[PDB]
Design an enzyme around this catalytic site. Sequence first.
Site, PDB file in Angstrom:
ATOM      1  N   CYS A  30      -1.630  23.619 -12.381  1.00 36.46           N
ATOM      2  CA  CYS A  30      -2.982  23.688 -12.904  1.00 36.46           C
ATOM      3  C   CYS A  30      -3.618  24.120 -11.739  1.00 36.46           C
ATOM      4  O   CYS A  30      -3.630  23.703 -10.597  1.00 36.46           O
ATOM      5  CB  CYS A  30      -3.560  22.066 -13.155  1.00 36.46           C
ATOM      6  SG  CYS A  30      -5.118  21.903 -13.852  1.00 36.46           S
ATOM      7  N   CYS A  33      -6.093  21.204 -10.657  1.00 34.72           N
ATOM      8  CA  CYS A  33      -5.794  20.287  -9.759  1.00 34.72           C
ATOM      9  C   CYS A  33      -5.629  20.735  -8.148  1.00 34.72           C
ATOM     10  O   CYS A  33      -5.829  20.012  -7.287  1.00 34.72           O
ATOM     11  CB  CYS A  33      -4.253  20.025 -10.325  1.00 34.72           C
ATOM     12  SG  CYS A  33      -4.238  19.050 -11.840  1.00 34.72           S
TER      13      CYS A  33
END
Lengths: 105, 681
Positions: A30, A33
Amino acid sequence: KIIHLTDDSFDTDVLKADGAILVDFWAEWCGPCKMIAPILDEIADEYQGKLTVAKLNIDQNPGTAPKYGIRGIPTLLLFKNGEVAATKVGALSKGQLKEFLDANL
Amino acid sequence: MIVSDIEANALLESVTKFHCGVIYDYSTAEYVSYRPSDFGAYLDALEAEVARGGLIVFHNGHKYDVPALTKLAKLQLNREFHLPRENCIDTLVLSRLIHSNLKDTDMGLLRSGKLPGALEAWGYRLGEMKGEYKDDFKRMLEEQGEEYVDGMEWWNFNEEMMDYNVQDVVVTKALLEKLLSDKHYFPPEIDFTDVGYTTFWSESLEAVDIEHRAAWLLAKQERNGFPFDTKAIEELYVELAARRSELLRKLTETFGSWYQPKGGTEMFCHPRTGKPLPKYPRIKTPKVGGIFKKPKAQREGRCELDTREYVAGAPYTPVEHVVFNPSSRDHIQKKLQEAGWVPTKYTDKGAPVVDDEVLEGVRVDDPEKQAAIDLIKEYLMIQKRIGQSAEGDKAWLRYVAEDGKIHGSVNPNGAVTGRATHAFPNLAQIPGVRSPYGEQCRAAFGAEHHLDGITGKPWVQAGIDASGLELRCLAHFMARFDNGEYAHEILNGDIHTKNQIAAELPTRDNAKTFIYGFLYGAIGQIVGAGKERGKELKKKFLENTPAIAALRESIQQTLVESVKWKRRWIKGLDGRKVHVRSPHAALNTLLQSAGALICKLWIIKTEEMLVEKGLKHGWDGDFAYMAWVHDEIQVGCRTEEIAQVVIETAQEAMRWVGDHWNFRCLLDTEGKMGPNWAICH
DNA sequence: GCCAGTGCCAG
DNA sequence: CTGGCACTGGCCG
Ligand SMILES: [Mg+2]
C-alpha cells in the site's frame, strides 16, 4: 519504541494493556501505508509518555483485521482499556495525527 | 416439390396449437397461406404432395415441423398424420452436410456472436427469425403502452406472425436452390426441383440420403430420451455437496483469508516527485472530513470531534477481504508460491499453469500444505461432478423432463469430419465407469429406469460398440499399400504388440498409447523422455511400418503443393467433401471421418433391419434408441429376448456396412445386455 | 447479463 | 484430433 504486534500477541499487547494504544493496520503493497510509516516513528518518540504505538501487518497476521471490519488501509485504531476509542483511515500528516491524538488523549 | 414451414405456440415438447402454415408449390410457382382454421387443409395439401410421390422441403423439419404436425393433428383434429421419411427434405440437414466447415446457431439456441468463423447468410436469417419476431412484437407493444410478458408473442396467431411465416418459406426456397446448385452433391444435368422422391435420392450423392436418414432417426432418438434416475442423482448430489463442504472447511483452515485492493479510483502518485505509480494499487482521496466538526460558541469561535473516519486529503487504499476459493486457480497459485512453489510453465497470458499434472508435481516444505494439494485436486474433481450433474446451467437435474427422461440434443453432422455433436446436456461426456463417481453417474442413465407403459416392468438395455474402429479404418486405407497385411494382423494376432516392436517400445501398453496418439498428429511422455527421443520413435515406427508412410505421402500429394493447397478437402466414404483444417491432421481427418460415416450408416441400417424383422421403434413398441456416442449406441428394449435380437442385428448391420463400402478390413461390434449404462460399458 | 481464460470429460 | 461446458474474474449498465 514501536510495538510490532502479531495475531497471537494482539489480545495481551492491546486489549489487555494499560494506557492509550494506537494501532496501525498496514500492508507492504500500500502506497499510503508507506507514507504514514515515517510519521508513526516520530509520533512514537513524542508521545513516548502517554501513548504506545503499535503496528500490525495484515498479510503476516490475517486473523485480527477482520474482527474490526477493516475496509481500507492504513487504518489507525486508538484503543483505551481494551476497546476502540477512536478510528481514522488514511495517510494522515504529522500535524493531523498530532491533533487526532491530542483531541482523543 | 413444395417448400413449407409452420408457426405453432411452443417447442415440440409442449406444442398444442398450430397457428399458421405456408406452402410454395414449384408446379404452380405460388405461395399459399393457411391460417388457424385452415389446419386441416394445410395437412391435406402436404398429403397430396405425398400422394403424387413428391417431396416436401422444410428447414429443420426433421426435428420440429414434421413431428409437431403429427402431434398437433392428433390433438386438434383427432387425425393420424405421418409424413414418410422418404418424402421429406430438410435444408438445415443439407446445409450441415454441404457447409460442414461452418458453424450455425442450431436455430437460435446458440448465440451467433460466440461462434467462430462465418455463418451462411440464409441459414443465419432462418435461425434468427424467432428473435426478430419477438423484437417486432415487443416494440409494437411498448409503443401502445402495453407491458410485455416473458414470451407472449407465441400465445396467439397474428398477421405479423403470418408475414414471418411467408418470409421463412421465401428464404428456405432461396437456401434450397443455393444448396442444389452445388454440383458435387447434385449433378447439373438434373433439375432437382422437378423430380419425384425416388429420383431425388438415387440421383444425388449418397451422402444426401445418408444425412437425411440419420437426422430422421436421431430426431426420433431425442424424442425417446434417455431414462434417468433422478432420485439417485439427488442422493449423489447430497453426498458430493457434503464432501465439498468438508474439503472447503479443511482448505480454508489451512489457507487463511487475506485482503486485496478493490475500489480504488485514483492513481497513486509519489508525494515527493508526483510521478504516477501505476503498479501501486489504486487509491481514494477523501474530499471531506476532518478531526473536528465545523462549528456556535465563543469558546470555540476562538471544539466538537468529527467521529467520521476519513480526513480530507489523507489518501488510503480501499480493500476487500477474500476467503480461499479452491476453485480459483489464481488463489491456488497465490497460496502455493507463498509456500515455496516455483512454477516451471506459464500460459500465453503469463499466468502459471495450474492443472492436475502440475499440481501433482508441486513440492512444498510444510507437510500440511503439501497434503492440502491432494484436497485441492479432489475439490476440483468434485466441483466438476456437481456442476455437470446438479448445479451447472446444463446440469442433468435441470434437464430431466416429466417423463423421467433426459432429451439431449444431437446435431447429426455437427463436426467437420461428419461426427455428430451432442448438447443440452452433452450425453457424450458422461463420466466413464473408471473415473471417480463414474459408476453412480453411468448407472443413473439406463433402460431399467423406464417402466413399461402396459406392464410396469422395467426395460432392459443393449449396449453395442464398434470394435477398434479407428485402427480398422487405418488398416483399410493402408491395404492398397500392404495388401491387407495390417488388417490381417488386427483380427488375427496382436496389432498392438506388432506396433510395439515397430516402435522399439518397452511395454505393449506403451504401444497402444503411442498409436492412438500418433494418429492425432502428436509426446515422449510415453517412455519418460520428450522432444528428443520422440523424434526417434516416429522415424523408427514409420520405418518399420512402410505402409503408413506411403498412406501419409499419398494423402499429402493429394492436398498440398507447398500453406498452398491443391485441394483443401478429402472425399469421404459416401463421396462428400471433408474439409481438412491442417496438413498434419489430414490423416486423422481421413480416419475419424471414415469411422464417423461407418457408424452413421451402421445405426441407420441397424434400425432398418430391426423394423424389417417386425420390431416397433418407440416406448409403445419394442425398442428405443437412447444414445449414440460416436462408436456406440445404447438401446432400450422391452424384453431381454428383444435385447439379444438388437445385439445380433447390430453385428449384421456392421458387416453389411463393411461390404457396402468394400472395406479392406472386416468390421465387428460387441454388445452387452444390462439394466443401465454402467453395466453396458 | 458477456467475453476470455483455463481445464477436464467423451470418443 | 473433434466437441461441450463449468468456474473465475473483469467490465457494464
Ligand atoms: Mg420453421
